[PDB]
Design a protein around this ligand. Structure first.
Ligand SMILES: N#Cc1cc(Cl)cc(Oc2cc(OCc3n[nH]c4ncccc34)ccc2Cl)c1
Lengths: 405, 549
C-alpha cells in the first residue's frame, strides 16, 4: 500500500528521549518480542546514523501472563500533533458518554498491516537496554504503523471506517469511537444484548485481522463536595465548615456563609459547643443543595489542555478533579481500591484517563502526589493501558485534601 | 594496518548546511615538511587519498612536535565539520560497575590497533574531510587530501566505530554464547569460565575473527596481565576495588586541595564503608579563590581523621552471582547523611555508597530513609536489573504509621527492621482532634511588603495576649514566628489556630530538621510539648478572634 507522508511539526525534530533502566526480567521479555516483530518485518535494527530515541517498557495488561511491549510515544506525539489532530483528526461523539454501556476493545494489532512512511521511520527509533551497560542497546525502528503513536489511527482511519461500515449500518444506535489502539463501543442495550453486539463486532474485526473491558458512563454521577450532618456543632467543626464553604465559592456560584461566619465571634474555645441559628441552617441547606448540583458556568474548551489532580485520602481512598482552569471543575470523583500506594495511584490514573477519553476524547495532564523518582521506578509494575498520559509530580496543599474529603 | 571489508554507515550533514570551507593558515617550513611525511604514509596505507582543487571544502591542519620527543603529529581541526555533521546515537550510555560483573575463570584484554583508521568512511562523505597542506608560503596550490577512514576529532568516529565493531562480533558472539565480550571504547574484555588453554584458544579464534575484519588485536604475552587497572578500579580475579587512594598530609588546604580531596573521597566510598564528606564539603561553600587557603574546622579535621582510619588497610568488593538475592542495608551516619552497602552473602559486600541529599528545606529521617531507598533501588536496576531486599534501621510500626497518614503516595519494596542505631523515628505527632481544657492560642502574623517590617502575636481564649515587632521579615517568617510564640508561652498542651497554610503544611509534615532556624526552634517546642492540636482558618474572614489578631 502507498504510504501517507508525515511532516514533523515545523522547526523542530525527532524526540531524543532517554531510556529508563529496565529490569532483567523486562529486558529478556522485550528482546523476545523484538526478535519476533523483526522476523515479521515490522521493525528493523537501525544504525548509529539514527540519533533518535523513544522509551520502551514491558507491561502485562489486566488478566494476562504474556508480556506486552509498551512504547512511550509521548514526545513524538507532541512533535506530530499537527498531523494527527489538526490534519488527520478523528471526531469525538458526545453521545458516547450518554450510552448505558461502553466496552473497550484493543485494535492496536490493526496497525502492522500498514506501512509507516519510509521517510518517517527514523523517528520511531527505540533502544533495548542492557544490564550494567554490559553491551550496546538493541536499536530498532518502525517499518509499519507503531502502537502508541497517535499518528497511527489518524492514518488507519479510512481503513477502519470500512471495517466498521456494515456493523454501523446495521446497528445505527451503537457508538464506535477509536482512541489510539482502542475502540470504544457504546449502546443503551440490555447487557447480554450489548455483550452480544460486541462479540458480533469482534467477528467483523476478525476478517480484517484485528482481534472486553466494561463501563457504564451514564452512572458516573458526581462526587458532590460534602458538608457534614450532625447534632452538636463545635467551633472547630465550624471553623472547618466555613473553610470548606468559604473555599467552595470562587468555584461554586451563589455560595454563602455570612450567617455561618457570624456564629464565630471572639476568642472562643474550639472544644466548646454552640447551638445553631436556623438561617445559617439554610446556607447549610442552600449550599448543600448547591454543592450537589454541578457548576453553573463551567464548559469544556476543546482548545485547552485538561488537568487531573489527585489526592490521597487514606484507607485506599483517593480523590480527583478534572478541570481546564483551576477550581473550574469539569468533573470530580473519588476512586477507592495486595494494593500499595503506588499500585492504587496507578489504577486511579488509568481510570481517570479512560473517563477522560470517553467524555472529551483527550487525556488530562496528571498532577501526581508522589516523588517523580518513585513514580518512575514503580509505575510500570501496575500499568496496563496501552496509552500513557502526561504527568507532573506535586505536593498537595493541606487544605485541598479535606476541602475535597 | 587493515581497513575493514565491512559495510559503511551513511553519514549526512545537518539540514540546510554545506561542508566546511576553512582557509588553511600559512604554515612554517618544518610544519609543512612534516605534514608531508605523515600524509604520504597515511595515503600509502589508504587511510587518505589525494584530491583535486575542484573540491570546494577544506578543514585546517596543523602539526605539533612532542615534549621530550622529536616526533611530529598532524592535528586536523574538525570543528566546523562537527558543527555541521548530523548528531549520532549516543555511544555507550553508562559504564558497567565492577560490582555488576559476574565472576569468570579467565578474562583477557584486547585493544584494537588504530581503531578509527582501521574503518571505512562513507564514500559519499569523505568529500568533506578535505584538508590542505599549504605550500612554502602563499605561492603554490596546497596538496589535497581527504579521508577514507574515520578521522580522529570527527563527530561520528566513536559512534560508527562502535557500531561497526558491534556488528563484527555478532557472528563470533552467536557461536560463542558462553563467552562474554565487553566492548569499551577501542577495548575488548573477554571473559570465560573455560579451562585456561581452551580460553587462550577461544581468544585467538577471536583475534582471527577480528583480523579477517580489519581488526588488529594483540597476541598472548603482548596482552595485559591482571590486575586490570580499568576506570579507577583494580580488577583482580575474585575482587575489585577503587584504585589506590592517597590522601595528602598537608600543612594548609586551598579550595583546589579540598576539592580534589572530597573527590577521591566520594570515589573511595563505592567500597570503603562510611566515608564522610559533609564537614569537608562545607568548607567549599561560598568558595573564594581556587588557591585561597581554607583553615579546616574542628569538625572537618575529625571527618578527615575518621576517613584516614577507614582507608588505612584495604577493602575489596566481590562480584555478582545472579543466583542469589541482593541484600541492601542502610544506616544513618549523622547530620543528614546515610550509608548503605550491598552484599549477596552476609558481609561480603558487592559495593557500598552514601546518600546525603537535602531533598526539601525541611524534611525528616523517615523521608530521607526513603529517599535513600529509592536512590539505592535505581542503582540496583541499573547494575543488576533487579531490586534488593532492604534491611532498614526503622520499625515496621513506625513506617506504616507515617506512610499511612502522610499526604504523598509512598512506597518501599521488601524490607525488614534492623536494630542498628540510630533508629529512625517520628519525633512528635499532631493531635487528630482539639485538646480539651488546653489553651487556645489564636496566633497571627503579618509583614508590611514596603517597610519589610512585621508584627507577630497571639490572642488566647483565656484573655492572655501578646504581640511582637520583627525587623526584616516576611509574612511567611512572621507566621512561623507567631506559632513559635504561642508554643513558647504555653506548656505541655497547646491548641493553636493559624491562618497560614504555609506553617500548617510545614509542621503537618512532621519536620525534624530544617534549613530554617525558626523552624528549627518550632521543632524543639513540638518535641518537648505533650499534646498539640493545630488548625487553620481563612484570614480577613470574621473567623474567631481572627478579626482580633
Ligand atoms: N580490563 C578490564 C576489564 C574491564 C571490564 Cl569492564 C570487564 C572485564 O572483565 C571482566 C571482569 C569480571 O569480573 C572479575 C573477574 N572475573 N575473572 C577474572 N580474572 C582475572 C581478573 C579479574 C576477573 C567478569 C567478567 C569480565 Cl569480562 C575486564
Amino acid at each position: 500500500i502507498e504510504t501517507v507522508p508525515v511532516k514533523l511539526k515545523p522547526g523542530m525534530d525527532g524526540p531524543k528521549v532517554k531510556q529508563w533502566p529496565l529490569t532483567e526480567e523486562k529486558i529478556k521479555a522485550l528482546v523476545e518480542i523484538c526478535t519476533e516483530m523483526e522476523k515479521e518485518g515490522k521493525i528493523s535494527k537501525i544504525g548509529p546514523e539514527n540519533p533518535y530515541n523513544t522509551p520502551v517498557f514491558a507491561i502485562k495488561k489486566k488478566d494476562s501472563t504474556k508480556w506486552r511491549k509498551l512504547v512511550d510515544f509521548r514526545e513524538l506525539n507532541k512533535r506530530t500533533q499537527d498531523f494527527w489532530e489538526v490534519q488527520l483528526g478523528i471526531p469525538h461523539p458526545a453521545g458516547l458518554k450518554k450510552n448505558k454501556s461502553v466496552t473497550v476493545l484493543d485494535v492496536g494489532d490493526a496497525y502492522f498491516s500498514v506501512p509507516l512512511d519510509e521517510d518517517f521511520r527514523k523517528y520511531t527509533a527505540f533502544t533495548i537496554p542492557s544490564i550494567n551497560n554490559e553491551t550496546p542497546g538493541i536499536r530498532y525502528q518502525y517499518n509499519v504503523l507503531p502502537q502508541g503513536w497517535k499518528g497511527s489511527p489518524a492514518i488507519f482511519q479510512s481503513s477502519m471506517t470500512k471495517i466498521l461500515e456494515p456493523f454501523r449500518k446495521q446497528n445505527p444506535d451503537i457508538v464506535i469511537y477509536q482512541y489510539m489502539d482502542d475502540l470504544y463501543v457504546g449502546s443503551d442495550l440490555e447487557i447480554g444484548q450489548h455483550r452480544t453486539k460486541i462479540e458480533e463486532l469482534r467477528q467483523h474485526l476478525l476478517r480484517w485481522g484485528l482481534t472486553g473491558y466494561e463501563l457504564h458512563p451514564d452512572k458516573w454521577t458526581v462526587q458532590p463536595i460534602v458538608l457534614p450532618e450532625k447534632d452538636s456543632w463545635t467551633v472547630n467543626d465550624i471553623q472547618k465548615l466555613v473553610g470548606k464553604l468559604n473555599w467552595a465559592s470562587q468555584i461554586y456560584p451563589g455560595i454563602k456563609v455570612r450567617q455561618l461566619c457570624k456564629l464565630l465571634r471572639g476568642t472562643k474555645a474550639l472544644t466548646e459547643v454552640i447551638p445553631l441559628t436556623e438561617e445559617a441552617e439554610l446556607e447549610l441547606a442552600e449550599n448543600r443543595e448547591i454543592l450537589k448540583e454541578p457548576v453553573h458556568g463551567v464548559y469544556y474548551d476543546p482548545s485547552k489542555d485538561l488537568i487531573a489532580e489527585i489526592q490521597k485520602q487514606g484507607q485506599g481512598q483517593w480523590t480527583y478533579q478534572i478541570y481546564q482552569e483551576p477550581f473550574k471543575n469539569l468533573k470530580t470523583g473519588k476512586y477507592a481500591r495486595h494494593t500499595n500506594d503506588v499500585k492504587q495511584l496507578t489504577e486511579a490514573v488509568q481510570k481517570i484517563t479512560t473517563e477522560s477519553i470517553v467524555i472529551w476524547g483527550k487525556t488530562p495532564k496528571f498532577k501526581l502526589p508522589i516523588q517523580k523518582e518513585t513514580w518512575e521506578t514503580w509505575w510500570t509494575e501496575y500499568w496496563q493501558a496501552t496509552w500513557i498520559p502526561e504527568w507532573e509530580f506535586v505536593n498537595t496543599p493541606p487544605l485541598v485534601k479535606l476541602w475535597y474529603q | 594496518s587493515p581497513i575493514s571489508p565491512i559495510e559503511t554507515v551513511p553519514v549526512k550533514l545537518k539540514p540546510g548546511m554545506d561542508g566546511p570551507k576553512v582557509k588553511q593558515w600559512p604554515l612554517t617550513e618544518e610544519k609543512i615538511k612534516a605534514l608531508v611525511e605523515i600524509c604520504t604514509e597515511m595515503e600509502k596505507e589508504g587511510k587518505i587519498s589525494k584530491i583535486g582543487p575542484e573540491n570546494p571544502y577544506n578543514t585546517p591542519v596543523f602539526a605539533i612536535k612532542k615534549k621530550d620527543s622529536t616526533k611530529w603529529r598532524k592535528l586536523v581541526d574538525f570543528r566546523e565539520l562537527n558543527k555541521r555533521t548530523q548528531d549520532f546515537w549516543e555511544v555507550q550510555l553508562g559504564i558497567p560497575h565492577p560490582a555488576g560483573l559476574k565472576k569468570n575463570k579467565s578474562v583477557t584484554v584486547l585493544d584494537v590497533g588504530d581503531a578509527y583508521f582501521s574503518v571505512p568512511l562513507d564514500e559519499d562523505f569523505r568529500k568533506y574531510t578535505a584538508f590542505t597542506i599549504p605550500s612554502i608560503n602563499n605561492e603554490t596550490p596546497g596538496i589535497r587530501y581527504q579521508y577514507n577512514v574515520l578521522p580522529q576529532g570527527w563527530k561520528g568516529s566513536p559512534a560508527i566505530f562502535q557500531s561497526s565493531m558491534t556488528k563484527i562480533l555478532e557472528p563470533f558472539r552467536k557461536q560463542n554464547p558462553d563467552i562474554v565480550i565487553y566492548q569499551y571504547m577501542d577495548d575488548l574484555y573477554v571473559g570465560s569460565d573455560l579451562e585456561i588453554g581452551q580460553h587462550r584458544t577461544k581468544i585467538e579464534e577471536l583475534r582471527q575473527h577480528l583480523l579477517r575484519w580489519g581488526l588488529t588485536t594483540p597476541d598472548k604475552k603482548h596482552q595485559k596481565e591482571p590486575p586490570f587497572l580499568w576506570m579507577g578500579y583494580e580488577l583482580h580475579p575474585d575482587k575489585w576495588t577503587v584504585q589506590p587512594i592517597v590522601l595528602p598530609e598537608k600543612d594548609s588546604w586551598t579550595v583546589n586541595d579540598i576539592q580534589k580531596l572530597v573527590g577521591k573521597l566520594n570515589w573511595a566510598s563505592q567500597i570503603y564503608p562510611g566515608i564522610k564528606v559533609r564537614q569537608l564539603c562545607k568548607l567549599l561553600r561560598g568558595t573564594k579563590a581556587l588557591t585561597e587557603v581554607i583553615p579546616l574546622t574542628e569538625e572537618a579535621e575529625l571527618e578527615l581523621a575518621e576517613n584516614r582510619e577507614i582507608l588505612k588497610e584495604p577493602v575489596h568488593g566481590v562480584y555478582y552471582d545472579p543466583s542469589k538475592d541482593l541484600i541492601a542495608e542502610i544506616q544513618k551516619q549523622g547530620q543528614g547523611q546515610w550509608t548503605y552497602q550491598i552484599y549477596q552473602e552476609p558481609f561480603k559486600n558487592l559495593k557500598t555508597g552514601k546518600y546525603a541529599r537535602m531533598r526539601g528545606a525541611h524534611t525528616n529521617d523517615v523521608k530521607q530513609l526513603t529517599e535513600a531507598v529509592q536512590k539505592i533501588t535505581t542503582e540496583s536496576i541499573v547494575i543488576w536489573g533487579k531490586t534488593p531486599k532492604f534491611k532498614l534501621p526503622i520499625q515496621k510500626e513506625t513506617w506504616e504509621t507515617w506512610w499511612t497518614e502522610y499526604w504523598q503516595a509512598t512506597w518501599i519494596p521488601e524490607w525488614e527492621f534492623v536494630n542498628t542505631p540510630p533508629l529512625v523515628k517520628l519525633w512528635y505527632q499532631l493531635e487528630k482532634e482539639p485538646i480539651v481544657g488546653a489553651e487556645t492560642f489564636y496566633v497571627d502574623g503579618a509583614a508590611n511588603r514596603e517597610t519589610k517590617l512585621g508584627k507577630a502575636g497571639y490572642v488566647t481564649n483565656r484573655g492572655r495576649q501578646k504581640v511582637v515587632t520583627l525587623t526584616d521579615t516576611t509574612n511567611q517568617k512572621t507566621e512561623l514566628q507567631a506559632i513559635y510564640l504561642a508554643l513558647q508561652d504555653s506548656g505541655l498542651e497547646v491548641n493553636i489556630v493559624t491562618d497560614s497554610q504555609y506553617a500548617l503544611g510545614i509542621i503537618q509534615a512532621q519536620p525534624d530538621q530544617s534549613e530554617s532556624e525558626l523552624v528549627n526552634q518550632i521543632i524543639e517546642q513540638l518535641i518537648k510539648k505533650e499534646k498539640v492540636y493545630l488548625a487553620w482558618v481563612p484570614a480577613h474572614k470574621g473567623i474567631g478572634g481572627n478579626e482580633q489578631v
